[PDB]
Structure formats: C-alpha cells, structure tokens
Design a protein around this ligand. Structure first.
Ligand SMILES: CC(=O)N[C@H]1[C@H](O[C@H]2[C@@H](O)[C@H](O)[C@@H](CO)O[C@@H]2O)O[C@H](CO)[C@@H](O)[C@@H]1O
Ligand SMILES: CC(=O)N[C@H]1[C@H](O[C@H]2[C@@H](O)[C@H](O)[C@@H](CO)O[C@@H]2O)O[C@H](CO)[C@@H](O)[C@@H]1O
Lengths: 228, 233
C-alpha cells in the first residue's frame, strides 16, 4: 500500500499485529518492552522490541517517491533506582530485523557491539550529548546520536512523542512533551533512501543491563503515505 | 490497533502486506485473482484470493465496541468468451481463513461444496436454482455466514470495464452498504442490516476471492483502500 496507518490508544493483551521480540509483552494494557516481575517491578538484564506486522513502504525507486510519515506515542519509565537505565527507542528498520546478539544495556536491543533510523530516549549515561543528564538521540545506520538534545527522565511520568518525517525537506522531527508542558525537540536531515530499504518495519525497542526501569509503551499511532 | 487504514492506488509487483492464496498474483500493476496465461488471458479451473496481512479488530466485547469500516476497490472482469465466470468477492473472515477445498467455480473460492464470513460477491455465472436473484443475469450479493445472497441487486457484466465499489458498515445502524458504479456512472446499490458480532470473531482479515470453473474470465483487482475504527455502541 502507498499509505498505511494504525492506532493503538492502548495495548490490550489480545494483540494480533505486534511482532514481539525478546522480553516485550503486554501488561496493564501497555507494552512492557522490558521484563517486569510478578509485581510489575523492572528487572535487570532485559531487552524487548515490538514491530507492527504490516510493512511500511517508506520509499519507492521506480516512482521516485518517498513517504511522509508520522509516529506518535507515549511512554513512561519507572524504577526503584534513582538511576534506571537504559532507554526506549522508536525505530525503523528492514522487515526481518531481529534483536542483534548482545544488544542489551545501552545498546537498547538495536545495536550490535545495519540499516535503521531510531529516535532513542536514553536515561543511563560516548560523547554526542552531555553524559551527566539523559538525552534524546536520533540514529541513522551505525551512527548513534547523529544529533541529540538534553532530556529529563521523570519516573512514572508519561512522555508524549511526535516523530514526523517530511520527504520534501527530508527533515526528521521529534517533539516530546510531559503533561506540564515541558518540551524537548530535535530534528535532523535524513534521506531515508540512503539508509533504509524501500520496505521497512517500525516499532520500539528498549533494554536494561545492571540498572533497570520499566519501558512502558502506553499508546502508539502511525501514518505513512508515499508522495511524489 | 483500534484503527487500521491502508490504500493501494495500484498493485506493483513488489507487495509485502498481501497474503496471496491459490493462483492469485500480481501482473501489470494489478492483482489477478484468477490465473491468466502469458497473454493476460484467463484460463478455466482457477481460484485465487488475497488478504491484507494485518488483522482488523472488527469488534471488541470488553469495550462493547464495533468497528466502523469502509472498503473501496476496483475490479474488471475480462474474457475472450461471452459467458465469463464466475465472479469476484470482497470478504471478511477469521484470520486463518483459507481456500475451502473444492470451492471453485460458483463457490468463488469462498464456500465449501455440499463458515464465518461477510462477503459482497459480484457474480456473472448462471445458477439454475437461483432463489435470491435472477439467474439469467449477473448479481451483486451480500453473504452472511452460511447464507449466500441474503440480499442482492441485479448487476451488469461489462467486459474489460472497471467497476468502482464502496463497501461501508456503520456499527450504529449495522447497515452494510454496497455502492458500485462503472466509469459511465451506471450505479448499483444493495444494503443489508448485519450485526457483525453475530457472524465474525473479534479479529478478522479482509480481502478478495475469485474463481472460474469451466467458464472463465479475469478477476482483476485494480485498486483497494480500507479503513476501520472501533467505537462505542
Ligand atoms: C546485562 C546486559 O545486558 N549488559 C549489556 C551491556 O549493559 C551494560 C552497559 O551496556 C549499559 O550501559 C548499562 C546501564 O545499565 O548496563 C550495563 O552496565 O552492554 C553490552 C554491550 O555494550 C552487552 O553485551 C551486555 O549484554
Ligand atoms: C471446472 C471447475 O473448476 N469446477 C469447480 C466448480 O465449477 C463449476 C461451476 O462452479 C461454475 O459455475 C461453472 C462455470 O465456471 O463451471 C463448473 O460448472 O466448483 C466445485 C466446487 O463447488 C470445484 O471443486 C470445481 O473445481
């Protein structure tokens, strides 16, 4: 399809179109990307990702078209620790993408110690950002944090995020906000054609090594349409 | 998702989200449900079906919600003969739906000879035992589970001509409306009240099916756009 969209106001346990990878699973009508015990507490050494089953036609060579797509989602991170790690990421990658071997910890289950475009929200502190505070980073292929912005982790607080891509400017924009209005934005130019195949899959990934926290994907809506 | 949308203005050969069944495949930027030869011509004894890969959340009991959905598509039937058969159909069925063994010919690859589903079939074949339509002429029929053509409207077969069809379901009225029109404006419409909750599981797959027995014709799906959204009710 030239255009595709879907919306998950919530994530009930009877999912049919989510490709669950690693420890990702539904709990409390939300996607717990990372493992939680029988009490819902985040645990160490965990990775998890989800992918919408329908592939997205990000761009088409034959027609010289690229997709204009938007990805809105909310998540929250909770941890008994004052330093929960490592982060959650929205990503776009080849359809057969799987969690790379040894991609835990700060690798968010996205990078091996490819092709992808990711917007990651890292909490646990490598210089492309200020190691002191957490950060939002955009990743293109094997280049993590090609562009970033200081971010504030807020345990238990939801962060609504809007990731948009305009093919006429090739501007990948990211706007994240908390319920009180606190905003964070980072954008970067990226020709999706030069880093991703025509057909791709979108989803989220998250991980925790020794430091942990839940990576709860509360909602998610997506839309893509090929434009000349 | 409570909402799913997708549109195919055309069907280029590099598809990913379509589940091809039977002889269904892509040729000349369109879906040929029934087999065609090297010359694009139809051949007898063939059945083909396509389903969108993602399942649609048609209705949900826990929230007492039913999906409002619309399905727009275009097809054209072409045959060197004059008794082109048997027909094409848009249908909704359980996710694991597959061609019922022996569902060829007038069974459109949808029903078994001698389910749960809603379908809107566009028939061009003749049935001597027709009870819901005039057998002497083709017909657009709405199917609900085991009842084929619970409602129908006379229709005309125009070789090679595209029929633009819009199938919509309003959970509030439970009206399943079908409006078909050829490029010259010739319009056909048939609607039937149906509570999808009583005939289909919460999750389903949408798609098309077609077949040809001794008589044949092409069942070319040229475009298709679909939308579905859950709401209280
Ligand atoms: C337990 C685990 O999965 N460790 C992976 C590791 O986690 C490390 C480190 O990467 C993280 O920065 C922090 C934050 O908590 O946790 C641990 O210290 O990354 C390795 C590669 O970099 C993986 O091979 C490990 O599996
Ligand atoms: C030849 C063939 O495929 N027959 C299938 C059968 O076909 C019939 C009938 O359905 C058609 O209306 C006409 C015109 O195409 O041809 C034959 O008379 O349906 C059977 C199951 O109902 C299949 O098993 C046959 O393969």
């Amino acid at each position: 399809q030239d255009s595709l969209s879907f919306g998950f106001p919530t994530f009930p346990s009877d999912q049919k179109n989510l490709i669950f990878q690693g420890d990702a699973q539904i709990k409390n009508n939300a996607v717990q990307l990372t493992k939680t015990d029988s009490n819902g507490n985040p645990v160490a050494s965990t990775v998890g990702r989800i992918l919408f089953s329908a592939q997205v036609h990000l761009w088409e060579k034959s027609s010289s078209r690229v997709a204009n797509f938007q990805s809105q989602f909310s998540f929250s991170l909770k941890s008994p620790l004052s330093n929960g790690a490592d982060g959650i990421a929205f990503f776009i990658a080849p359809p057969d993408t799987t969690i790379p071997s040894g991609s835990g910890g700060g690798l968010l289950g996205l990078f091996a110690p490819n092709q992808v475009i990711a917007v990651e929200f890292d909490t646990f502190y490598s210089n492309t950002w200020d190691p002191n505070y957490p950060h939002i980073g955009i990743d293109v292929n094997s280049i993590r944090s090609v562009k970033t912005v200081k971010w504030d982790r807020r345990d238990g607080q939801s962060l609504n995020v809007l990731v948009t891509f305009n093919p006429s400017t090739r501007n990948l924009d990211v706007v994240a906000t908390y319920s009180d209005g606190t905003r964070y934005e980072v954008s970067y130019e990226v020709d999706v054609r030069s880093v991703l195949p025509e057909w791709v899959r979108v989803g989220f990934s998250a991980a925790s090594g020794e430091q942990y926290q839940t990576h709860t994907l509360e909602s998610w809506s997506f839309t893509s349409t090929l434009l000349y």
